[PDB]
Amino acid sequence: QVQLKQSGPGLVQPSQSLSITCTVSGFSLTNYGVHWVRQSPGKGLEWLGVIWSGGNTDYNTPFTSRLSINKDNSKSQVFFKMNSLQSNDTAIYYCARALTYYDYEFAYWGQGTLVTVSAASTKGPSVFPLAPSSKSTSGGTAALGCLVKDYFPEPVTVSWNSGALTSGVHTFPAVLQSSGLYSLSSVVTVPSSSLGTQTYICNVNHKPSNTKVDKRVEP
Amino acid sequence: QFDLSTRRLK
Amino acid sequence: DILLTQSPVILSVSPGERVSFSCRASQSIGTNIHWYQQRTNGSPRLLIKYASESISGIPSRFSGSGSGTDFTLSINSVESEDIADYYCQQNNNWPTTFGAGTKLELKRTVAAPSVFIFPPSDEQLKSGTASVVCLLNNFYPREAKVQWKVDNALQSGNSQESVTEQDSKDSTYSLSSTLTLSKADYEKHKVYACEVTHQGLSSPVTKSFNRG
């Protein structure tokens, strides 16, 4: 099928530059233009630019001087680069493809790339168990979780049992602590009778720090 | 306001 | 640039109801408008193109109408999976621009939270910090009160809350309140208590533990 897969999230220092790679499949770059859109708290969805089939680029007016899009057709790659970023450039960046080669109705999107702009430093999280017990048990159902503490920047991905456990999972939005580091918990409810038979593991992945931890959670 | 953590309006 | 104004910002409806989102343009744009859905942690999803034209894979309950400056997206019978934000896009004038979006929230029957409590792990204690987590699971509506008490001393300012987006299946919310102390303070005390108030409870629910 048609897919757009962007490079992972990361930290970029103020005044520095941003680089994202969009790798496409299910179509050729020689036949479709690839667009770049961003989503920020300040301005919501903004169309940034486009590289067309034949290599021509268009940039939205406010970005003409600090934006360049390039591509490798043979590699099916599109490269987004933006200079001199300020903190308000913190946004999710998407590459996208329209229904027809010349149009702008975006039927296909990349998964997005959360870029944080900040002078600070990348820090991986610590993962601690939220162990099930009689105090997290009610009517044959036990709750358990993982505390993902003290990382920067957002985001972290959390799954359970390598993706095989999705039902009853709640991964809370991160909160920013006074330390300027993020923290979240991920929880899941299971039958309490499975606690003695089934292993429960939160798979934590903080891509900006290349930190992957698998945390086993036991009663 | 758009929230980058959840990709949802808050 | 064309300004697209979506109003209201928040819509709250019950399942099975018809619902309409409005998109108004700062000048005529013909029928050059597209609509998008964004679910929690999702990328935008194309629902309608050119005011009214359908899109492959999009449920029939979604439709669109309008021309000129006034446009409408409609869901004839809302489901829980429709919980999302909705955006409009014009492309009659370069550059293509987007509305600020409308949030779609679902009503449902009151559901009291299940309340669970988690002491700090010995693991975390080795690091010199203690987190006590209080979980309020699958409740509606969103409003709730969490009050921490350590040895009958009311805690204030040393906890943080987080609430999930509305569940796309059962329309509920879940909440975590995390109380953070130093290892020393944590060791100086015995009783840790999370007291929960919610519309679905006929009296506050207290979940607590003694350290050890």
Numbering used by the authors:
A (entry chain B): 1 to 219
B (entry chain E): 2 to 11
C (entry chain A): 1 to 212
Mind quoting what the paper says about this structure?
Our recent discovery of meditope, a cyclic peptide that binds to a Fab cavity of cetuximab, can serve as an alternative, noncovalent method to modify antibodies, with a precise ratio of two meditopes to one IgG. We have also determined important residues emanating from the Fab through systematically grafting the binding site onto M5A, an anti-CEA mAb. In this report, we investigate the possibility of increasing the affinity of this interaction by reaching through to the other side of the Fab hole. Our recent efforts to characterize and optimize the affinity of the meditope–Fab complex focused on the importance of cyclization and side-chain modifications. In these structural analyses, we observed that the guanidinium nitrogen (NH2) of arginine in position 8, located in the ‘back’ of the meditope-binding pocket, is partially exposed to the other side of the Fab. We wondered whether it was possible to reach through the other side of the Fab hole by extending the side chain of Arg8, increasing the surface area to improve the affinity of the meditope–Fab interaction.
Given that the addition of the extended hydrophobic groups did not improve the affinity, we investigated the possibility of adding polar groups that can participate in hydrogen bonds. We observed in the structure that the terminal methyl group is in close proximity to the backbone carbonyl of Gly112 HC (3.3 Å for the first copy of the meditope in the asymmetric unit and 3.5 Å for the second) and the backbone amide of Leu114 HC (∼3.3 Å); thus, we expected that modification of this group with a hydrogen-bond donor or acceptor could improve the affinity. In each case we preserved the original length of the main chain of the n-butyl group (four atoms). The crystal structure indicates that the terminal hydroxyl group forms a hydrogen bond to the Fab.
